[PDB]
Amino acid sequence: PGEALYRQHCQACHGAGRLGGSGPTLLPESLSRLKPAQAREVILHGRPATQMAGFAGQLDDAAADALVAYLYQAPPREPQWSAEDIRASQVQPHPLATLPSRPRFEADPLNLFVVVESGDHHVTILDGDRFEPIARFPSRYALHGGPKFSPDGRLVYFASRDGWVTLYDLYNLKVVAEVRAGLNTRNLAVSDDGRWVLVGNYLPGNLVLLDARDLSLVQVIPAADAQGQASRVSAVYTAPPRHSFVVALKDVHELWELPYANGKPVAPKRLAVADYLDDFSFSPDYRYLLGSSRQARGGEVIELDSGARVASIPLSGMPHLGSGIYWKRDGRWVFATPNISRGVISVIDLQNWKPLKEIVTDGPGFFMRSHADSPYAWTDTFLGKKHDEILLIDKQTLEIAHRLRPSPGKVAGHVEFTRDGRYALLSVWDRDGALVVYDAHSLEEVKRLPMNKPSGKYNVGNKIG
Ligand code: DHE
Numbered sequence: 001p002g003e004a005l006y007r008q009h010c011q012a013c014h015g016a017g018r019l020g021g022s023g024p025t026l027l028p029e030s031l032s033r034l035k036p037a038q039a040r041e042v043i044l045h046g047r048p049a050t051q052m053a054g055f056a057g058q059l060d061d062a063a064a065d066a067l068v069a070y071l072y073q074a075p076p077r078e079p080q081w082s083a084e085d086i087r088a089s090q091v092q093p094h095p096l097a098t099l100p101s102r103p104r105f106e107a108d109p110l111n112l113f114v115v116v117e118s119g120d121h122h123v124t125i126l127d128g129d130r131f132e133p134i135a136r137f138p139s140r141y142a143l144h145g146g147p148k149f150s151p152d153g154r155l156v157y158f159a160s161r162d163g164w165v166t167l168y169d170l171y172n173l174k175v176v177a178e179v180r181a182g183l184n185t186r187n188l189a190v191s192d193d194g195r196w197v198l199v200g201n202y203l204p205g206n207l208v209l210l211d212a213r214d215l216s217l218v219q220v221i222p223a224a225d226a227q228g229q230a231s232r233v234s235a236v237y238t239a240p241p242r243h244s245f246v247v248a249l250k251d252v253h254e255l256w257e258l259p260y261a262n263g264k265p266v267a268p269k270r271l272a273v274a275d276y277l278d279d280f281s282f283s284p285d286y287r288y289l290l291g292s293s294r295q296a297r298g299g300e301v302i303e304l305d306s307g308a309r310v311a312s313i314p315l316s317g318m319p320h321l322g323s324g325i326y327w328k329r330d331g332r333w334v335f336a337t338p339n340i341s342r343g344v345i346s347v348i349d350l351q352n353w354k355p356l357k358e359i360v361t362d363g364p365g366f367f368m369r370s371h372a373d374s375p376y377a378w379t380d381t382f383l384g385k386k387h388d389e390i391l392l393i394d395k396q397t398l399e400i401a402h403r404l405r406p407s408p409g410k411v412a413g414h415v416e417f418t419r420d421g422r423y424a425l426l427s428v429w430d431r432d433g434a435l436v437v438y439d440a441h442s443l444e445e446v447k448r449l450p451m452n453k454p455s456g457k458y459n460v461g462n463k464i465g
């Protein structure tokens with residue numbers, strides 16, 4: 001009965017077959033982060049300050065539950081998104097060929113910040129020296145993952161949960177092109193020569209290769225092991241020194257490398273893995289791959305050339321290895337990583353792959369960042385009842401040195417530095433949130449920009465260097 005209800009009240013914005021429109025996509029995969037009870041409240045009483053109105057006046061309890069069950073029930077057949085669908089979605093409001101190649105502003109283009117405002121779905125381009133905005137524009141719904149840049153830092157590529165890819169030109173402050181690569185998307189990667197964008201999708205289970213200059217479609221690459229078993233893509237990353245993309249697969253015992261030195265990467269090199277990999281991190285020299293297993297079997301280290309498993313790292317809880325950092329301690333490489341289920345910062349010695357120590361915190365965090373100029377590692381306890389402070393771990397002592405509390409009570413997380421590391425920018429993820437600027441040397445606040453749930457911020461210089 002929910003189908004008819006959806007057609008009369010919802011399809012006006014959430015689109016036919018729930019694929020999206022004025023409002024977001026409402027497939028089961030789309031709502032994986034939304035509990036049905038929460039989806040039920042949003043339907044009855046709407047979202048404040050959004051175009052989603054409450055329907056409690058037109059629907060009763062039975063109809064309410066019917067819609068909820070309908071949204072979370074799998075369709076009789078899996079929805080498609082073909083090459084034809086992708087090409088038809090392409091738009092090009094400002095092709096590069098028609099735009100000059102000089103910045104239209106004073107700000108240092110290498111110190112600009114891309115700031116995601118996920119509360120009202122906007123993006124701010126921020127002068128990294130004055131800490132003031134030079135542009136702001138609405139974005140696609142639910143941006144996730146770090147926006148990727150071109151090698152020269154001029155272009156930036158956004159990926160939305162619902163599969164929309166946006167190409168923005170920082171020099172002219174204009175949207176260049178957009179295309180829908182899939183229905184449920186993880187992340188995208190840009191090749192180190194600037195030619196290619198590779199989109200890793202959950203739904204469909206495929207990779208989508210786009211031309212990096214206009215987001216046009218090059219080829220759709222189904223994700224399936226050598227036996228033909230279909231799989232979702234966990235994540236895609238670029239290995240510059242290897243001039244290749246590296247793809248983690250969610251559901252098959254396979255790992256892919258797609259080289260692009262000799263042209264469009266459409267043929268994968270398949271490496272067998274003993275256990276599934278959800279996310280991974282590259283060693284500073286891209287020789288080794290640190291992978292986190294879905295099962296609590298600890299971490300896994302793999303040599304990329306051969307594909308051999310060289311070490312197994314026991315890890316407390318479930319480490320978010322994909323966002324870890326490295327640095328030199330006693331002239332030796334060390335690796336730190338936050339955690340999703342336990343309040344700990346796991347630190348690993350790269351030399352013998354031996355875990356050094358486990359730093360205790362007030363709860364599991366989501367992010368970790370540093371800089372060659374900062375003597376600390378900056379992490380958080382994003383996922384805990386205590387979550388309003390940003391922890392600064394001294395690199396040499398491996399102990400929580402200082403703590404920053406931008407807005408007591410509200411959730412704080414994610415750090416990004418200016419290109420010279422002189423300042424650090426922190427986010428307060430709240431409806432009454434803010435982007436807060438701190439002197440990374442004196443650790444004193446300098447400026448505060450109110451924003452509606454600002455998420456990540458990304459410095460051009462640091463990301464392309
Ligand atoms: C694989 C991956 C990346 C690296 C992508 C890249 O940049 O190439 C990433 C990055 C990110 C980055 C990029 C930061 C960076 O510094 O690069 C941010 C801000 C972020 C905010 C969130 N992440 Fe993320 N995130 C996951 C996966 C990932 N997140 C999950 O699996 C998880 C736990 C659940 C999910 O449904 O995806 C998840 C939940 C969250 C959130 O709910 C956050 C807090 C808010 C949101 O928008 O959903 N993730």
Ligand code: HEC
Nearest residue numbers: 009010012013022023024039042043047050051052055067
């Ligand atoms: C256009 C005005 C809409 C109609 C008609 C319906 N919905 Fe909606 N919905 C719309 C928007 C723009 C948004 C996004 C709000 C925001 O966060 O900015 C939503 C949101 C939802 C959600 C939450 C999705 C999520 O958080 O992941 C749900 C579950 C939802 N809408 C369901 C829903 C149903 C069942 C509708 C018919 C009764 C319906 N919506 C109508 C826009 C519009």
